[PDB]
Symmetry: C3
Subunit: 129 residues, 3 copies
């Protein structure tokens, strides 16, 4: 697979895609398996983290920016190497256990698309196995 389109709206942004993943699980009919969530963009990634406090996602974005700023020792002419770095640090995919037809997530644990070079028209892939 299911491809979802996402429109990102800031240069960096966490977008909670947990329900997009649940919908793919529900469509699949799979009761027990794995959900794989993959980002095909080299300046974005996927992570799993706190999903009910905006201050946590702000703290992550702000502090990743502090450590790998937009301006620095970067040769890359497009000027988005900071985004490439942060993308690799978050990861290109994550996976979640499906048990009893539900994503086996912890308390206030959600699945995020992590944009580091928005605003852009983005895709995310969800495969249920």
């Amino acid at each position: 697979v299911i491809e979802y389109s996402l429109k990102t709206s800031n240069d960096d942004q966490f977008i909670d895609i947990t329900n997009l993943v649940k919908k793919a699980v529900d469509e699949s009919g799979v009761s027990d398996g794995m959900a794989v969530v993959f980002c095909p963009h080299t300046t974005a990634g996927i992570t799993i983290n706190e999903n009910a406090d905006p201050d946590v996602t702000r703290d992550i974005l702000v502090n990743l920016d502090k450590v790998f700023p937009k301006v620095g020792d970067y040769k890359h002419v497009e000027g988005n190497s900071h985004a490439h770095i942060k993308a690799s640090l978050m990861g290109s995919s994550q996976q979640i256990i499906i048990e009893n037809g539900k994503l086996k997530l912890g308390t206030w644990q959600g699945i995020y698309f992590t944009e580091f070079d928005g605003p852009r028209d983005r895709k995310v892939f969800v495969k249920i196995i």
Copy 2:
């Protein structure tokens, strides 16, 4: 799936859970497949790294702390954003190949639960496919 309970004992800690994963493999009877190890906590994660030198795990913890300290530019009122960041950096899960009924790990390569907000009663999930 197998849920294991872990009691962590320091604010940050690497706990070698390789044998908990081997036990799940052995229980499953699977000779060839994958072991998926998932952390349902947003202030802890899973990584794979050196498992026979305490100085390496100390170096990792200490240097992750140096870069993302407990005190800093953090809005989050609980005061554990450092842990949320480090958790995303390690990852919410890892996976290991099962070959000939054994985890296909390299020399002195082990699977760790990475606590960043202990001491706490924690869980880790192991799914064998």
Copy 3:
């Protein structure tokens, strides 16, 4: 699974192994599934990132080095804790969707072995499921 041998040539290096993964897919005959790429070395890892601009891979290596330098607050007697840290940050494995017998990768998105303690004789494992 397929084990590939790689000879790395610098202390840090990104090696594009995308075609090694495609060959494993092609050998498997699998049309739809997953490719899992695993690094058995604790001082190297796997990441997915830009594969057509050398400046991006240079920016990543250089800036990871800047943040976690070779010399610092490290007890580990071999002197490669920087590599252990960076390895955990990239990850021990990545996975890619196989669709229509092809790796489902984005534009200029490639799979890299990330060496942090070369030059060495290394292995990478590719499992197709």
